[PDB]
Design a protein around this nucleic acid. Structure first.
Ligand SMILES: O=c1ccn([C@H]2C[C@H](O)[C@@H](COP(=O)(O)NP(=O)(O)OP(=O)(O)O)O2)c(=O)[nH]1
Ligand SMILES: [Mn+2]
Ligand SMILES: [Mn+2]
Ligand SMILES: [Mn+2]
Ligand SMILES: [Mn+2]
Ligand SMILES: [Mn+2]
Length: 903
DNA sequence: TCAAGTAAGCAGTCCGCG
DNA sequence: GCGGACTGCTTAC
């Protein structure tokens, strides 16, 4: 097989590499790497190396990496550019793997671990590590085994061995319900003292040294705890055995509120699953506890136990170990669904970077572009420092707040990358400038054509047409992957809807789920077979279709994020190819494109409807338009339509056959106007929205920019079995809104759009009547706890103190003197509840760490003093009043003359 | 040599207000 | 009490 790297590190003048050889064996080597950098040379000099602007360079080959670094500094002191890749391990990777890397994941050791530490005196701080590690479960992907290290004797209690027999039993039978499918994969190892546990763990680690190291909060808790615990018991050099090269660094991570200390283990690639989840999931969760996320992702139940975790080992050691094991499995289950590890490996090897560098779009693109240029013997420019400058972005149209009955939306495919490709925007394709007219003159086609010769953006930039830039070239390759995967996602989605429609009428028999590839639209033959299947088989097929869809979503959305990341990186001062001329060439072109096509669509629709000057486009954000289809429907009638699906079919066909060619004609004209390299403005129909035929539903509404709701029947060719609410920006979509309130507001919206005013009013009255019975957690707001200390003046709120911070301070005063109460961690999320006046907490609100029950000490007081009236008014009524005023209706009737006896 | 972007809405505090 | 000038948090893109 072809060779691939596992990890790479630079240590002094040495590159340390772990890799898979031609026989598929893991190896390690230390290389005294001889890097090259480049300097501009005279035209007289015969060379094969040119910078990106075609200027000749001379290669400087150095005896070691230290000498290369010194030369860089000398060059800066002289005042001359030092060209080439200054991150030497990327150069090493590029030289060592001078081909497209095909990796074999089964050869890569992926480890997933979780540790338990009993602490009777608060959170066990990793920097101190003053408490015994009393459990470690470590799953190894190569062995496919969960290795469990269990401490039986400690200063906080001596316990008996954990029972696998009891572990497998159902909870309702006194067991722990450790999933049956991993019971046979457990290797259990009890220890009578911590020293031998930790020593065995280190020996084990040497035999099975992780390449990718993952888990939940491993980077911030487990890794530094283990390192420091070992350091404190055995000494520093023993703790350095966690690194295959015996080198570690206490690294300081900094943000706008403070800093934290992690441990870099050289020769390991740490991908903390919490960080993978935050980057790749595109959710914003009220809580990031593993229990909460597992429940969200997998619909598993909460792992129940009596008392606090600080006393769980002593009271129920059996469950303690079982839950440690299950926690490791939960991350494996989340990854089996989401496939973030596979994504990271794909991306890391594609770029030729350390796998952990997938967190940095800038590092990823620097490597991709370097490797692309190196292949053509081109030399990359030196990184330069730049002051941060604000610059303009997208256009957002101001909507008229209103109900909108029939709506059809259109959206530009991968806009910013498509602009890069159409215009041919790259550092080395810049051709010059032209004199800019006001943007509205380009939008209206009244400004003179910028150039007959070059490809243009309305920001004043011109680009060469007759050759590709490295940025267009490399962005295209990733875009084409994104397109492939999105196609798989949408087919899986379409397939799901077919299955959902068959679930309406089973059809009782004993059969099997059909073996199909869900990534491609089912054939007629498969569709026929599906109609004959049982509910059990269909539900299994639906599960598989949805998992295929999530896999396609993971693969497409994050490749989209990566290419959009390249467009944004052009506006980040740390990017080697930073250039506001290129960043603004993109954003300005986008503003023009949106507003240009708004005009063209309004023009076209007026024309076909036999009218003049009517406004069809009601809204647009960056690269979308929302078109009022009321006149299109009215042109026909109502009541020419048999059912809802009839008018949906009509609008679908109208969009594809009529509007789409006009949109394309429109964008082709704009492409000729800007004299661009390639026409790539492709605006697909997205949503078809409206009320059920014959209902009193309002279809949709807008309250303002980035705030709207639509009752959608078809989305990008997915025809829903049941209408789906598309809600953007409203409180239902915000993680700060209480769970039960998100639910109630969504139902209010559903009733508005599908059923009408009376149905809304009916629901509002019931919810108001029953609000006070909802579980306190379901009605608590959520916020991030940033800059707590800043506002803490002797335990009390300082000036400007945010509401949620005041809550934290109230909590801190309430728990002072209790070592068992969970501390609010700076930057994490909290639940927030308002308190009635005269409460014993002495303030108007309280806040506690989210995803948790509030500590039992003050629980009863919080419940007693909660202000339901303020809760209702702030989280539910205020937003609902915004929706209903926009939509021109009332959530309450509503005094009128009709005061007689209407029974 | 660590290091995608801008636009924009709502909720809160502070403070003015015979 | 409201509305305006800020911050803080958050979402759409
Ligand atoms: O995270 C983002 C999202 C959008 N944008 C910009 C770039 C993107 O091309 C543009 C339009 O946003 P869309 O949500 O329409 N995504 P895009 O057009 O890139 O892909 P598509 O619409 O094909 O899923 O807004 C970003 O810069 N960062
Ligand atoms: Mn014993
Ligand atoms: Mn645990
Ligand atoms: Mn788009
Ligand atoms: Mn699209
Ligand atoms: Mn869009």
């Amino acid at each position: 097989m072809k060779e691939f790297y596992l990890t790479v590190e630079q240590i002094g003048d040495s590159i340390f590499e772990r890799y898979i050889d031609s026989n598929g064996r893991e190896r390690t080597r230390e290389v005294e790497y001889k890097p090259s950098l480049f300097a501009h040379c005279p035209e007289s000099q015969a060379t094969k190396y040119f910078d990106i602007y075609g200027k000749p360079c001379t290669r400087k080959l150095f005896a070691n990496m230290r000498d290369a670094s010194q030369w860089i500094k000398r060059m800066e002191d002289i005042g001359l550019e030092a060209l080439g890749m200054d991150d030497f391990k990327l150069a090493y990777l590029s030289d060592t793997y001078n081909y497209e890397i095909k990796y074999d994941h089964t050869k890569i050791r992926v480890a997933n671990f979780d540790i338990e530490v009993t602490s009777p005196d608060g959170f066990p701080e990793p920097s101190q590590a003053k408490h015994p590690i009393d459990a470690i479960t470590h799953y190894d992907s190569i062995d496919d085994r969960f290795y469990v290290f269990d401490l039986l004797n400690s200063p906080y209690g001596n316990v008996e061995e954990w029972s696998i027999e009891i572990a497998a039993k159902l909870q309702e039978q006194g067991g722990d319900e450790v999933p049956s499918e991993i019971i046979d994969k457990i290797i259990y190892m009890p220890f009578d003292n911590e020293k031998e546990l930790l020593m065995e763990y280190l020996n084990f680690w040497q035999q099975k040294t992780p390449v990718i190291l993952t888990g939940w909060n491993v980077e911030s808790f487990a890794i530094p705890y283990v390192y420091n615990r070992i350091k404190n018991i055995f000494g520093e050099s023993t703790a350095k055995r966690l690194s295959p090269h015996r080198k570690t660094r206490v690294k300081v991570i900094e943000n706008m509120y403070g800093s934290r200390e992690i441990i870099t283990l050289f020769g390991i690639s740490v991908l903390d699953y919490i960080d993978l989840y935050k980057k790749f999931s595109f959710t914003n969760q009220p809580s990031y506890s593993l229990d909460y996320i597992s429940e969200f992702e997998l619909n598993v139940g909460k792992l129940k136990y009596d008392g606090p975790i600080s006393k769980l080992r002593e009271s129920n050691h059996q469950r303690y170990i079982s839950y440690n094991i299950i926690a490791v499995y939960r991350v494996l289950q989340i990854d089996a669904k989401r496939q973030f590890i596979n994504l990271s490996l794909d991306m890391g090897y594609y770029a030729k970077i350390q796998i952990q560098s997938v967190f940095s779009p800038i590092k990823t693109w620097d490597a991709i572009i370097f490797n692309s240029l190196k292949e053509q013997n081109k030399v990359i420019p030196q990184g330069r420092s730049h002051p941060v400058q604000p610059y303009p972005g997208a256009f957002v149209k101001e909507p008229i707040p209103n109900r909108y009955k029939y709506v059809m939306s259109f959206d530009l495919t991968s806009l910013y990358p498509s602009i890069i490709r159409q215009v041919n925007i790259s550092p080395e394709t810049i051709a010059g400038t032209f004199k800019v007219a006001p943007l509205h003159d380009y939008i209206n086609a009244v400004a003179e054509r910028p150039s007959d010769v070059y490809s243009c953006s309305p920001n004043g930039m011109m680009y060469y047409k007759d050759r590709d830039g490295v940025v267009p070239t490399e962005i295209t390759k990733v875009f084409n992957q994104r397109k492939e995967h999105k196609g798989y996602m949408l087919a899986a989605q379409r397939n799901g809807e077919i299955i959902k429609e068959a679930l309406h009428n089973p059809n009782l028999s004993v059969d099997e789920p059909l073996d199909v590839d869900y990534r491609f639209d089912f054939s007629d033959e498969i569709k026929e077979k599906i109609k004959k299947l049982s509910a059990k088989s269909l539900n299994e097929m639906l599960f598989r279709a949805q998992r295929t869809e999530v896999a396609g979503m993971t693969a497409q959305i994050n490749r989209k994020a990566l290419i959009n990341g390249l467009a944004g990186a052009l506006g980040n001062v740390w990017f080697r190819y930073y250039d506001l001329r290129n960043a603004t060439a993109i954003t300005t072109f986008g503003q023009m494109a949106l507003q240009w096509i708004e005009r063209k669509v309004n023009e076209y629709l007026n024309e076909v409807c036999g009218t003049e000057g009517e406004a069809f486009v009601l809204y647009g954000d960056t690269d979308s338009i929302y078109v009022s289809a009321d006149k299109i429907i009215d042109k026909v009638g109502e009541s020419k339509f048999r059912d809802t699906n009839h008018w949906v079919d009509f609008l679908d066909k109208f969009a594809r056959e009529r509007m789409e060619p006009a949109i394309d004609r429109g964008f082709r004209e704009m492409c000729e106007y800007m004299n661009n390299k390639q026409h790539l403005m492709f605006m697909d129909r997205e949503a078809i929205a409206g009320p059920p035929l014959g209902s009193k539903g309002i279809g949709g509404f807008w309250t303002g920019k980035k705030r709207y709701a639509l009752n959608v029947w078809d989305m990008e060719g997915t025809r829903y079995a049941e209408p789906k609410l598309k809600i953007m920006g409203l409180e239902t979509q915000k993680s700060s809104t209480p769970k039960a309130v998100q639910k109630a507001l969504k139902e209010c919206i559903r009733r508005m759009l599908q059923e009408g005013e009376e149905s809304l009013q009916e629901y509002f009255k019931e919810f108001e009547k029953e609000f006070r019975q909802l579980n306190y957690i379901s009605i608590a707001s959520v916020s991030s706890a940033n800059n707590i200390a800043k506002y803490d003046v002797g335990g009390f709120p300082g000036p400007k103190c945010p509401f949620h911070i005041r809550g934290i301070l109230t909590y801190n005063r309430a728990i002072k003197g209790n070592i068992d109460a969970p501390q609010v961690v700076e930057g994490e999320k909290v639940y927030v509840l308002p308190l009635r006046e005269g409460n014993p907490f002495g303030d108007k609100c309280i806040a506690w760490p989210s995803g948790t029950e509030i500590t039992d000490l003050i629980k009863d007081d919080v419940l007693h003093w909660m202000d339901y009236t303020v809760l209702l008014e702030k989280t539910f009524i205020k937003p609902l009043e915004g929706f209903t005023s926009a939509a021109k209706l009332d959530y309450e009737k509503k005094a009128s003359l009709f005061d007689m006896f209407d029974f």
